Write a protein that binds this DNA or RNA. Structure first.
Ligand SMILES: Nc1nc(O)c([C@H]2C[C@H](O)[C@@H](COP(=O)(O)OP(=O)(O)OP(=O)(O)O)O2)cc1N(O)O
Ligand SMILES: [Mg+2]
Ligand SMILES: [Mg+2]
Length: 522
DNA sequence: GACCACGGCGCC
DNA sequence: GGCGCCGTGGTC
């Protein structure tokens, strides 16, 4: 136990008042390096002395430092080491629980824990050349990028959504008071259980499905879809569900999350939260903003650009199909993208009996579910009742992947990111085949996730040069903010960085759009 | 108050 | 296939 400050290169531990770094109060700050722990008398002032956030959850402390106008980049983070060893290492509780430590709530102990866990995990990673490359060239630099992204935030049209809330509210009351009419009485329409009784016991409607854990009669949209004119109350419920979902999740909560000092909405990009290597967004999740329905697009317009700036949206086209062509090597699927063909449009045109010309974007979005559904083990049964109906060596790669997965316990992406799928030899078929679907999907979704992470690493410092910002990542999409006078060049540059991030056997192409709001930018 | 399981559902 | 957040119903 030594006096503050710590020497250069120590591991940091910190305690927040809450999980969100942009809203957190730094309750404590400590450091550790070689037999001693440096606890800070005043955590906020002690931030100015660190050159780097090195330790567990490094990005979170860096985001809080950017909130205070401090350039404190995140460095080594044992969480990132463990996540690359096994993507089920998602929390500091589990990592310490598994590699020799205990995740307490004292800054000093967290600094010493970060020191012990780094030495241990870094030891496990010796000889893992491809995972060390993913750590040095992707994940660790990415944590720095995501640090500035989270601290930047996005502009939100608050007064607009407040006005939209009143309009959506009264349209809800209409659908409700109606549902109560056909029901003959009032009840909590939000109550999943009360609805079941009204539908299947009082109205005697046929129960088409059962819930997973409690065996109750389901009221999901898919079930009600088959009842939407066996009775009229069903159609109103679906429209009621859609409205309350968007109002309670987006319209009302988001306006209340504008940050005092920045005046913008801030999310968190979790780097060790998925089994495939994707990022996740939380508090709030900005990777699930509505876009499907008209009302959803109304909400999407609330995401606007700063005055004098324009949003730039970039999105890889048919990304996982292009990745699939490279992973399998299918000459056909490879040649498909060499002719500039679009599978989502070709599938969407059989679905709706419409030529490729008049294929709207709502029926091609439906083709993605079909194409990617069919691709990853979709049963012939479920395909029937949603689109309303009664590539040779892809399979070769699937089996090669599953066989190798069974032999070594893990599948891997193009760059070597691993996911462990132990149930590939389970004796219960359903458990085995579910694991199989998880298994051969990971290399396709993870490679696409790798390319995107790697693109962000290469693009971000270029954006700093041009005075542009990186606002959001949506799996295979980037939302940037650039000054109006530079938006066009920024769009052309980012388009170029993303398409040539890591050449594949098929060209990567990116659709790009510019607009004052998120909807006009796509 | 907190946390939880569940059904349900928004997006990729 | 991969996520996170919703209200409800529930416990502590
Ligand atoms: N149901 C889905 N299932 C998936 O697995 C994806 C994965 C695979 C896909 O390539 C990737 C990015 O999604 P998207 O950008 O929306 O789809 P794509 O990149 O292939 O086609 P794009 O219109 O941009 O040319 O997420 C998406 C959907 N959407 O329903 O969406
Ligand atoms: Mg795409
Ligand atoms: Mg996309």
């Amino acid at each position: 136990e030594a006096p503050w400050p710590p020497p250069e290169g120590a591991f940091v531990g910190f305690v927040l008042s809450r999980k969100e770094p942009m809203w957190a109060d730094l309750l404590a700050l400590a450091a550790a390096r070689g037999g001693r722990v440096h606890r800070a008398p005043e955590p906020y002032k002690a931030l100015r002395d660190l050159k780097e956030a090195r330790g567990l959850l490094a990005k979170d402390l860096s985001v809080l430092a950017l909130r205070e106008g401090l350039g404190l980049p995140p460095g080594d983070d044992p969480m990132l080491l463990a996540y690359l060893l096994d993507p089920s290492n998602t929390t500091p509780e589990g990592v310490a629980r598994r590699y020799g430590g205990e995740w307490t709530e004292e800054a000093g102990e967290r600094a010493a824990l970060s020191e012990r866990l780094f030495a241990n995990l870094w030891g496990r990673l010796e000889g893992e050349e491809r995972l060390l490359w993913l750590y040095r060239e992707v994940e660790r630099p990415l944590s720095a990028v995501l640090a500035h992204v989270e601290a930047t935030g996005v502009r939100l049209d608050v007064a607009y959504l407040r006005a939209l809330s009143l309009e959506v509210a009264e349209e809800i009351a209409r659908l409700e008071a109606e549902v109560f009419r056909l029901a003959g009485h009032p009840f909590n329409l939000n109550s999943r259980d009360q609805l079941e009784r009204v539908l299947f016991d009082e109205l005697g409607l046929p129960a088409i499905g059962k819930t997973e854990k409690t065996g109750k009669r389901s009221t999901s949209a898919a079930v009600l879809e088959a009842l939407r004119e066996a009775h009229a109350i069903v159609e109103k419920i679906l429209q009621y569900r859609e409205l309350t979902k968007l109002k309670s999740t987006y319209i009302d909560p988001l306006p209340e999350l504008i940050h005092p000092r920045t005046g913008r909405l801030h999310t968190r990009f979790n780097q060790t939260a998925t089994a495939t290597g994707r990022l996740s967004s939380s508090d709030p999740n900005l990777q699930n903003i509505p876009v499907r329905t008209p009302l959803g697009q109304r909400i999407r317009r609330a995401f606007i650009a700063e005055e004098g700036w324009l949003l730039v949206a970039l999105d890889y086209s048919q990304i996982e199909l292009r990745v699939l062509a490279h992973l399998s090597g299918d000459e056909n699927l490879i040649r498909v993208f060499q002719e500039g063909r679009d599978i989502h449009t070709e599938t969407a045109s059989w679905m709706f009996g419409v030529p490729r010309e008049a294929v709207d974007p709502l029926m091609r979005r439906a083709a993605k579910t079909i194409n990617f559904g069919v691709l990853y083990g979709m049963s012939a049964h479920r395909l029937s009742q949603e689109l309303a109906i009664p590539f040779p060596k892809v399979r070769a790669w699937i089996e090669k992947t599953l066989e190798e997965g069974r032999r070594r316990g893990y599948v891997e992406t193009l760059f070597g990111r691993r996911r462990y799928v132990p149930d590939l030899e389970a004796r219960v078929k359903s458990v085995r085949e579910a694991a199989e679907r998880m298994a051969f999907n990971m290399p396709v979704q993870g490679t696409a996730a790798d390319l995107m992470k790697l693109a962000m690493v290469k693009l971000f410092p270029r954006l700093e040069e041009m005075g542009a910002r990186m606002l959001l990542q949506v799996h295979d999409e980037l939302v940037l903010e650039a000054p109006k006078e530079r938006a066009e060049a920024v769009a052309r540059l980012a388009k170029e960085v993303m398409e040539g991030v890591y050449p594949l056997a098929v060209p990567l192409e990116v659709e790009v759009g510019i607009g004052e709001d998120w909807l006009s930018a796509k």
